[PDB]
Structure formats: structure tokens, C-alpha cells
Amino acid sequence: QISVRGLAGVENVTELKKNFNRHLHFTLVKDRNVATPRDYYFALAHTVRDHLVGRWIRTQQHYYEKDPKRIYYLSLEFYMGRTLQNTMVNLALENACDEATYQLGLDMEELEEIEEDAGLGNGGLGRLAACFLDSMATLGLAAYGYGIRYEFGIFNQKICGGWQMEEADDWLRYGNPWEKARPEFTLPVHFYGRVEHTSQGAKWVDTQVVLAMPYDTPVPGYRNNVVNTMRLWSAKAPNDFVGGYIQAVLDRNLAENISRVLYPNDNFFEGKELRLKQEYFVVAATLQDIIRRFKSSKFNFDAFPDKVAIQLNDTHPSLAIPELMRVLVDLERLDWDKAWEVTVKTCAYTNHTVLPEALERWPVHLLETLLPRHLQIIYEINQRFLNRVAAAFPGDVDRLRRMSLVEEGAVKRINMAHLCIAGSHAVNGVARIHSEILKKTIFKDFYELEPHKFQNKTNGITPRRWLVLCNPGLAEIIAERIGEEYISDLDQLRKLLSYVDDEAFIRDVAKVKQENKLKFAAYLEREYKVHINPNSLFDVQVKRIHEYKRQLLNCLHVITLYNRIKKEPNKFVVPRTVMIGGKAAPGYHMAKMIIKLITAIGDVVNHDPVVGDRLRVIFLENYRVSLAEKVIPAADLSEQISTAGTEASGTGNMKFMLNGALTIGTMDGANVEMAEEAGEENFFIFGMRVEDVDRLDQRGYNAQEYYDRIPELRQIIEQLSSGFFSPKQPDLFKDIVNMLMHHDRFKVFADYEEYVKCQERVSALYKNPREWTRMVIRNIATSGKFSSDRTIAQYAREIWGVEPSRQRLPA
Amino acid sequence: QISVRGLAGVENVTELKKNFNRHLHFTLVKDRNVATPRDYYFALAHTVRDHLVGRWIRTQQHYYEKDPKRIYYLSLEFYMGRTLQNTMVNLALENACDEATYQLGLDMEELEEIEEDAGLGNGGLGRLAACFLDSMATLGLAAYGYGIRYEFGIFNQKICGGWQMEEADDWLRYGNPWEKARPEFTLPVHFYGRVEHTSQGAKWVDTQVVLAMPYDTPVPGYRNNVVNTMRLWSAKAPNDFVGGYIQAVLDRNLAENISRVLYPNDNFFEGKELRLKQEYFVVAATLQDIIRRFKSSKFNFDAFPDKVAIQLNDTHPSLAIPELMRVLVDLERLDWDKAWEVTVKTCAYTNHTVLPEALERWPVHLLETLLPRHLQIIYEINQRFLNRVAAAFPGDVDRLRRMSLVEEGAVKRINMAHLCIAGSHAVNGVARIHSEILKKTIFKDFYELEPHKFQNKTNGITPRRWLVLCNPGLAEIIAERIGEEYISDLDQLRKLLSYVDDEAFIRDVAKVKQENKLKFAAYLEREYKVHINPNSLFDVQVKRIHEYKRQLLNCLHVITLYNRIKKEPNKFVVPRTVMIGGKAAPGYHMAKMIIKLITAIGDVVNHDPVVGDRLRVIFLENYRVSLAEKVIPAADLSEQISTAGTEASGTGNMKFMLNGALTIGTMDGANVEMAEEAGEENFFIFGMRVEDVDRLDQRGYNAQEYYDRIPELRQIIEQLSSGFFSPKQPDLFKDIVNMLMHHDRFKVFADYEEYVKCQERVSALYKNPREWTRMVIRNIATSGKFSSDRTIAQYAREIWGVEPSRQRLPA
Ligand SMILES: OC[C@@H]1O[C@@H](OC2=Cc3c(O)cc(O)cc3O[C@H]2c2ccc(O)cc2)[C@@H](O)[C@H](O)[C@H]1O
């Protein structure tokens, strides 16, 4: 039906129907007469997975015999989403499976809606991991994702009475047809115990054992026949063990609780023991796998960093550094100095945030108890690292205190970021502005000691999931003009600037948007019986709910729009559907209040007969990867409105740009590079830059000043306090008011005026559909930099020391 | 290679090799080069399971369209063992799979050793369930096994320092290739809450929900193309739910603990709340399934007992009676009287023991809390039942007290046996002597009220698992003489009496035994490096360790044999390997002491150079279904030595008889019917009959009398007390001595003298191998009565009201 979806060859189609029917019979043990849509989805999934298998075995045996340098991407999050569509796209089977299912009397897109998200992440860091796996496979890297097979991913969000309610994300209830259990490669992980020092140095003894059972999931490259592996570990009680026999069997649960659930904190450090156990579990099992694979290869650990790269996604797997030192010194019996040389050449660290509340600072007592040998190693790392600091900066005692892996205080803690910098040959931020901030502020001391350590790798997104999968309409009109090479060479989208005056392309770009908006409107109607005006500007802020992301600033604008209509009812305004969605971490009270305020605004705005269909505010329930794939192709305006200096990069920004939305944003994270790529005349940039936030911090942020000088702001704060948006609970939003007036770390009121005025420019442009569409073409055409293929090629060349390849494997 | 194993057709073999290789590639995702024997086992299992699938779908759709009466066998235990061999035998694929694997360079029997027992039972009651499923499928009954999918079956037994140690039976670690998850047919089960009485009668409200997820396993009949279903329920926390979000997700474990582990009590009632929850879980989910299947059939609950039989394996699923009454009255709104008429015509009860410690007597407070509506219904059942008792036996107030479902005392309890008799149209014992005892003693009052209720169904064993699978050598020499109809018509073994003087058959029977003994000796050598003299009489007592089963009496004989050798070293005796095995329930101290005494006797006997290879005592570790299949075909002498009146039936007795062992036993359980079938001249019967035990109970059992009058007994008791068998812990066996001398409920010393003398007759016959073998032929030839096909045909005709059929399904 669509070119970019590939060929429905008569042979391909007849085989797929045959294999579909074989799986329905032998795999599902179902007759055509009793089979539910869920059975049909599973029959298709098994059929599509069969097509991976030959390439999956051949890829791995190609890496065995050719023995390239292996890349290990360690993350406590893989935010993978659904696998069925992505697999069909990367194997060129989408049109064949669509034809095959149609001939069988089935709608493939209804079947796709049955699959559970693999929601094994919180947000950007998690989704980055997932985009990276896709790009490493597409660039033919010998790459392995290593993580935890959480039984429960990020909670399912319900909205009840306008409030977030959390349900368990039981994603494995009907099984996972993609993964292969590898219980034969199960490994032991140790906890607690103590250290004895003997003639053969240190031994870690009297430990409790937890087994790590790996589950392998295929990662297909784009039409290159490469299939890499994501290995996720599952916690299992060891074989051998007052409540007696029954209670001892039930107590197996405690060890298995290690892989039970994803900690739902986005950009926030909660120092829970169980979280620490998850971090060590993934590091200990993974490094045993890496060492085993290293020893059984073509030929001493001198060559270890020429055969191994360990990339640490944030500080979460930071214990890989002391764990690698433990295995090399305590088990392989290397000298400390050689072990340390190997470790630093093997490991690199990615930082994702500058917010102090996000930094991992584990109490020393917890490490003493859980991981006694790791604490000893961390102390020895610290002594030798501070010895090098004293030699470079003699007598700079405060530098010694600031740089230490040990933080003094009521509770002594280990700074895991300091451990990562000390134990890694490369440290990177995730956008140029963030990487510079790292060198200027939080890691200034480390930058001065080792300037060549510090790099930038600007984030990207995979144009497979984030254009070809989610927006086939837009992929199609682009391919019709420039062919298909752009799908793994996204800089070719620059060829689109040649069509900025082409009436046909202009018509087609607006037509695809219109279709995406009618499809999203229909989804909202089907699933939730929510009606939206599809002739409205779709104004979309989707991301985790946080003070720094300033959903509240969006809230102040929505009420401004409502209050201007009530003041001048007869005055024409561009109709808007304002859509906000995202999950609040369960214990983040302010975030849960903000969700309640969005729904409360909706309760007034959406029922005012003076407003009617000119303005709608809706909270999108259960924002996750599959919902991103539906709403982002439907968006006209992308809200990227973080306080300047607070969003390290963002990736949602890059998805919206790729899918034909215009961006309203601050000069923050990758927004700066996106505005540089398209031209700032093609971006709605507003608000304080980093330097203006710093100047305001220097003289003190007084929010009362803004309230006193802006009548429209005062009216809104007064509506919040007096109970206009909570008439039966008039003091409901006291906490939001009090934070905005007195405790606002993110300076919401300081950007209010520039934001409202910038929003006026957005509406002005929207009234001119031709010029709106021409500005959209200028955005899409310059989004190529933001491909994760670009990001990964930089990692491969500048940190891992390996060369990418688009060249195909032979079958 | 062997006729009874079927045809290795060139086409059959080439297909199996093709499907083996397909599963290795697509199912296991493995190359020939990396594949372990475990992978090869799984490739074969998946290949063999594929052959079930067509027959499995067709059988179930045949029952849908033909709508016969359905039989529901409710058991908290299915002791199934391994499935791979049984499946190949029942589909006639054993020789083809053997040839197919041989051509692939693989030993099918090594592959079979990789499969985990489905050890979802304790002993006889559990194994009876399993034999019954096999026979119902072989007799073309529309039968369903309903139970619990325990994550952990009966514990793995290790012997450490001569002591039992329990390990968790992690039978699902590598998956179960036989079962099909049916998460789509998940049902809710309710716990706790309270009852409100409204205008529409009673409602059960404010309950906690646990979901029951069914797993369906195929049950193949013998070469009749019938494939029935065993449905096992798995506990799952409901969708919707101070430790906050993380703790609430971890707390899902508590509801899922319901299907975590099999209670390892054989013939003993432990009143644990979690056990009660398991009983209600299996009853509530099962009866919802039954009611749904009843409503969606060819046509009011009047016809319900013409379409449904519920068979209660012991009192474990006794709550089916009040549960069926709850659904019919509270949900379907039937009058009490009609509901009760339906319930009694639907339900029947099997009793497995007369021992008071085994009877389920649940505290009323526990039922009040867990199952408030069920307690109300049980009270109303009791009132109406005792009203019928008062009318039949006016003024017999003590009869009213003895028959009540309610037992008065410090703790008021419900007698679940009384509930079963009241709520069932049929009650059966499991051997003629046991069924008569029921009518004469524990259920005398009930027999007088309703004599036509009380039946006998003598236990049986499936000659598929217990002859063709385990002893193909013996199956073969029998088929060579009488053909193969005996395999599902076991009374044809009577034709073997024609060969009692045939020199060839006599030679062949002794040759098969000799081969079985060399194969068992080799297994013991391979797995445990234990050496046994294969030219010794194999004297075997395998069953759960209990005082009533009198492993201790076997112990007194072994030491008698040792003490006679030491007294007269030069005197020739028939060499013996004395083998004892079985599990002790973890909390049964006396049972664990007995295991320790068997190993302690071994520690002396097996190292005395005067004894050498003339006598060996060994404890067989981890007695289970797969180990029964190895040792029972190797046995010369079957020990069945329970105190007369205590073993309801036994089934181990019947296995040994089928496999060419002679029996030494009491006139207890089915031993009486086995001696009647073969002729008592062909059995080594000894000891008190029931009437002699009763006479001893009447004047008081004084064990000191026996000790005072039997010098050989006194010597042994003195060896036990003085520390001869525990030299470093001389008082180790004080508890055994004290129980034997003062508290022995099973009168061990009273049968000592007759047992030793009967054992002398066994040895005398063994010295004459021709006459031993002729007596064996007379045993095998008369074992036909003991087929579970015979037992099931009786259930079908005399309780369920359905006609068996050996006729085949068409494909
Ligand atoms: O940001 C400031 C913090 O926010 C809230 O607590 C949490 C912070 C948080 C966040 O800022 C972003 C997230 O994605 C997640 C967060 O989780 C918690 C939290 C607090 C209590 C818990 O039960 C668990 C975590 C506040 O409740 C807390 O007082 C404050 O320290």
C-alpha cells in the first residue's frame, strides 16, 4: 500500500499466512472458531520473530569468529515500547504481514494495539538506551544492552477524580514472545558477608547468593541483516536455601524482589537499599558475562580494553568500576596499578543532569553492610585519585575536599559521579550547552585535572521508531521526493529545503498533519470518549511531570487564554486543544498537585459555554512510548519550556521536530542546537538564557515583584488562592500558590510575560497556514543532526574506538 | 528395536528429525555447535508435544458438539512424574523418536533423564489422581483433572550426615514444555469480607480478590487418539491493588503465595490458614469453570447432575459442597431444597485413611474470618442433616452429637468428612477391607442412615507408566506370548498361567529381572558412586516414612540378619541388598529419626568385613515417581508391612506385583485382594490380622512383654540404647527406643517374631531360583484386577453414571 513499508511478494505473503496458521494451531493450541484478537496478535508476533532467528544466530557467530571490540551499554532502564511494528519495519515485512493478515480477514493495526509496552524506563535516559540499541545494530556495532528484566515496569497511570492513581504494569501477564530465557547461563551475585585478608590478599566471604538468570531479546538493525542482543537479568533464589520449611520456601520472594519493579523516580535520587541491590545485581552479573566472553576469544588482561568498552548510562551502574577492580585484583590476581589502568581504559560515563537532587550519594554505612569489599576498593581509589590531585594542585586543600569520592557530614556518603569520573577515560554530557556547563560548574575541578576526559555527545532519536513507524504518511511524502536512503542517513532531509516553495509538497505536508490529527482525535474518542476540535492548533507538552519542566508555566498561559476570552468574548482567537501528559513519581507531592491543577483547569474551561470549542485543556492519561508514537505525529506546537540550564538535552523536542511540529522553547539543552540547525527565525524561542537565570540568582528571585507588576498574573494567582478552580475545596492549591510566590527554584513568573507574547506569535503564524507549513518544512529538513545514528557514530569513533558500518551482513 | 514400542517408519523418522531441527533453531534459538543435552531434550519434548495438538483440539471440540456428562476430578495433588516417555508410549512414537534421535547422534534415554518430575503430590493419593487421569483418557471419558499449579512440588530430599535435608523443588526453572498458559480464562476468587442479607437474600461483600490463572496440560489415552485436559490454577494478584508504591507492588507476593508450594504432609492434617486458602482457591475457580461450561451447552439447573460429576479426592476440596450451594442459592437464586438436591447428585467423596490425625477439622473461627458465607451454609447444611437423623433415629441424642458437622470443644471445628458424606450421593473407600472398616467404625452412623451411599472402589495403577514405560523388557516377553491387548485389558495377563511350566518363559522372566537389577545397580553407581551386589536378593521398602508403615519393623529385621551373621559367621545366608527410601514430612520428628536409624545401621553393617557383600542396607535418596520407575522393576521382594487396619489400600504394592517382585506383607489394604487374586500360597503373608490388633487394644499393648520373652529383640533394643549404632552420640536413638517400649500405636514388637520367620521362608524360596520365578509368574499373571482401568470403569458405572469405551477417535 505504502512504498517505505516494502513489498507484499505473492510468495512472502503465502508463507506468512502459512506460518501464522501453524503458530495459531501448534503454538497457541487454538482453532479458528475460538480464537480472540489476542491469539491473532500472538500468532503474528511468533511468525515475525521466526524471521529474526537466522540473522540473530549468524550475527552472534559472526562476532565470535571475527572477534571485534564489544560495546556493553549498562543501563538500569531500557524504555523499548512495542516490538512487533519495529521488527516488521527493520526486516522490510510490514506490507507483506499487512497483506497476509488482510487475506486472513484481519486488521494488523488492531492486532498491534494488543501488544504491551516494554515500559522498563522512566523517561529520556531510558528511551535514549532504547534508541541507542536500534542505532548500534543499524551501524553494525558488536553491541550488547545489559539491564534488569523488571517484572513490573513504570506504573500504569489512571486519572481518578482528576488525580493520578498508580496501577502495577503487569507487562508479562500474557507472556513476551520476543525474549528467549537463557536459564543455562545463570550466574551468582553476592551480597553482605565480610572481607578476610590472607596471604593471597582479600577474600569476600560469608555472602548471601542471588542468581541472575538472563533473558535475551533481539535488536534488529535497519535492513542490514544484523541482529544484536539486549540481555536483561532476572533475580532467582539459590538452589539450596523459625517458620520452618513452608516459610523458607515463601522467603525465596525476598531475593526475587530484586528484579520485581522499576524505581519510578525520574531525575531524583532515593537512597533505598533495594535500589542499591538492583544496581549491584546488573553490574555483578554483566561483568562476569563480559570477562567469560573475553577469556573465550582469539589470542593476560592488557588487551581487555582493546576488546571491551563499558558505557555507564548515568551513575546507576557506577559500581562496575570497583566491581571490575575486585575481579581483576581479588580473582585474577593483577597488581592494583595494572587493574586500574585496564578499568579506566574500559569504562566511560554519561551524565544526564546537573540538578543536585538527582546525584547518587550512597550512605557509607549501607555500602559497608551490603558491599564491604566494594567500599574498601572505593576508599583505595579515592586515596590514589586525591594523591594525583595533590601533585597537580599542591596545597589546594579545598579542591581535595570538593573532588573526594567521600562526602563528610552527619552521614558520610560516596559521590558516585566522582567515582565515575575517576574510573572512566571519558565523561560526556548529552548536548553542547550541558557538556559546557559540566566543565564550568559541577565538574570544573575534574575538567582542570583532566581536560581531554570531558566530551559532548548530543542526544538523538531513531528515525525508524520516530518517523517510519509512527508517521508512515510523512515518511512516504519524503521518500516520494528523495528516496529511502534518509531512513539511515537522516542528514539527507536537507534535500527537503529544495521543496520549501513547491506547492505540491506544501499541500502534502499539511495533508499528512491533518490525517495524523483526525487519527489522534479518533483514538481519544474510541479509548476515552473524549471529543477534540480537529480544526484547532494541537498544543502538546508530553514528558515527566517536574517543577523544572514548568508544566505550571503552560498552566499559567492556558488560564491567560481563558481569562482573555471571558474579558473580550467577541474577539477572534486561533482555536487550541492544549494537551498535557506525563507521569508523576508516586512520592512527588508537587508533581501530583500539578496533574490535579491541569484537570481542574479543564473542569472550568471545557464546560464554559462562552468558550465552547475555541479552547480545550486535556490531560493525556498514561503517557508512554506507544502513546508518544500517536500524539507526536498529531502535534502542531511542541512545548519545550524548561528553565534555561535545567534540561540537559531532551529527546521529546527532537521527536516533535522530526514529525512536523513547530517548537516553543527556552534556550536550554538540545533546543539551542535545534534552533541553530533550522535557523532561530524558524523556532519560537523565549525567556531567560542561562546567564539571565544566574543574574537573577545573584540578586535573589523575588516572585512578588512579578505578581505586583503584571495584572493578568495577579488575576490568575488570585483565582488559584480563592478557589475558582476548586470551588468545593477552595484552599486545594495553597501549596502551588505558596511555592510560586515564595519557594520557586524554577522562576516560573520571570518567564511568564515573554512566554505569553511568544504564544501570541505562534497564533499569528497559525492564521497563515501556507507560511506555518513552509516553516515546518524548514524544521523537518534540518532535523537530521538529531538522529541517534549520528550520536552513536560519535560514541564509536571518539570514546569506544570502533568504526561504524552501514554495509549489510550476507543473508 | 522392541515390538511394544511401535514402528520406526522411514517417513515418521525423517519428519521427527526435521521437526527436532526446526525446534532447535526456531524454539531454542540454538546452533548444533553450542547446543547442550538440555537443549536436545527440549527440542524432542516440543517435537513430541506437536503430535498431541490435533487430537487435543479435536477431543475437546468432540466433547463440545456431543455434550456427554463431564467428570471433574478435584485434587490438591497430581503426582504426574515425567511426561516425555508417557507421551511417546500413548501415541506409539517411542521407536520412531528413538531411531530419529539415534540418526541425529543422540541417546534418547540420556535426554529423558533431563526432564523434571511434575512432583505435585506427596504419595499414594497424589499418584492415584495421576493414574486416574491416564485411565479416564484411555476409557474415552469426558474427564478434567482440576488442581493447583504449585511453583514448588514435594521438596527434593538430600541425605547429609545420614539426615534428611529439604531443598526447594524448582521444577519450572527451565520451563514446562507440556502445559499451555490460558491467562485469557483467568477467574476471580474471593476471601474474607462479610455477608449482608438483603431482599434478594445473602450477598458476600468487602472481599479481597485473588485471580486464578489456568494452565492446561494434555492427558493422552492409550492409542485411542483421545487427549483430555489437566487444568492447574496459578494465583495472581488482582489488576488494581504505608510502605508506599514499591511496598504495594512487592505485597502482590502475599496473594501469589497461595500457589507457591505443596504442603508436604502425607496422611496428616496441619490446620494452616494458607492450606485452607489453597483448598478454597482450587474449589472456587474450578466450580466457576464447571458452571460456565454447563451454561454454554445443548438444551435450569435440574439437568446439572446429568451433565456434571464432581469427584472429591479426600476432604481437601470438600468446600466444593458449600461453594456449589453458594453459587446456586446466592447467584442463580435457586430455593435451598432444589440447590441441595442438585449438589448431592453432583458430588461424591473418596476416603483414603482411617487414621484420626489425617481428618480435616477446621477451626470455626478460621472459617468465620476467611469464608463467612461458607460457614453460614455449613451451619444450615448441618441443621437440615441432623433434622433427617432425628427423624430416622428419634431420641438418639448421642448419634446427633457423633454425626454433627460441628465438633464441640475448647476450639469448635467443622468435620470436613461429615460435610462430604452429607453433601455426596456416594462415599467410597479404596480397598474392600478399608470400605468395610468405614461401614463398621468411623462412618458406622452414616452407613445406618444411608446404606446405599457407601461403596468400595479398589485402587489401581496404570499399566502404561507401571509396566510398558518402566519395564519394556517384561512388557516385551509378555507381548511375545499373548500380544498387546493386555496393555489396555490387563485381565488378559491370566493367559500367563499357561506358561508356568514353560522353560523358555521361566528363563525370560528371570533374565528380564537380572537386566533390571544390573540397570538399577549401574544407576546407583553413576549418580551416587554406591556399589551393590547384583547377585543379592533386592529387598525394597519404598513409600513415605510413617510409624504406621513400620519402616522400623524392617529395621529390626535388618539388625536381626546382621546379629545372626556375627553369631554364626560360617553359616551360609542368601545375600541381600536391603533398600529403604521415602520422604519424611519436614516437621515429623519420629520419621526423620527413622531415616537417621536406617543410615546408622548402614554405617555399621556396610563396613563390617565379617559381613562383606552378604548384607547391604542403603537408603534410596529422593524417592519420587521417576525413581519408582527405576527401582520397582529391579525388586525381588516388596515390603508391604503396615499394621493391619492402617493402610487403606496402597498402590506401591500393586506396582511391585506387576513388575515381577514377590510380596511380604500383612493382611492390610489391597494386600488382602492381591493375595486373594494370586492365591495366598503365592504371597508371604504374616502378622496380626485386624481382629488380632483389636484383641491386643482391648487388653492393652505391653511392648515390655515382647522384649522380656525374645532374646534376639532384647539384644537389638540394647544395641539401640547403648549407642552401638551411634557410638559418638550414644543416646541418639533414645526417642525411638522410648516410643517402641512405651508409646507404640503400631505394635512393632507384636509382629517381630512372625516377620523374621516369614523372611526365613522368603530366603528359603530364593535359594530355588526356578520355583521363585514360577511363583513370580503366578503373581504377574493375576495382577490384572489392579489396573486403574478396572477402578475407573467401576467409578464411571457405579458413581458417575457414564459408560467407558476403548473405541478410538477418528484421526
Ligand atoms: O523535588 C523535591 C522533592 O520532591 C518530592 O519528593 C520526590 C522528588 C521527586 C522528584 O523531584 C522527581 C521525581 O521524578 C521523583 C521524585 O520522588 C520523590 C520521592 C519522595 C518520596 C518518596 O516516597 C519517593 C520519592 C518531595 O515530596 C520532597 O519533599 C522533595 O525533596
Ligand SMILES: OC[C@@H]1O[C@@H](OC2=Cc3c(O)cc(O)cc3O[C@H]2c2ccc(O)cc2)[C@@H](O)[C@H](O)[C@H]1O
Ligand atoms: O504423627 C504424630 C505427629 O507427628 C509429628 O508431627 C507431624 C506429623 C506428621 C505425620 O504423622 C505424617 C506426615 O506425613 C506429616 C506430619 O507432619 C507433622 C507436622 C508437625 C509439625 C510441623 O511443622 C508440620 C507438620 C510430631 O512432631 C507431632 O508431635 C505428632 O502430633
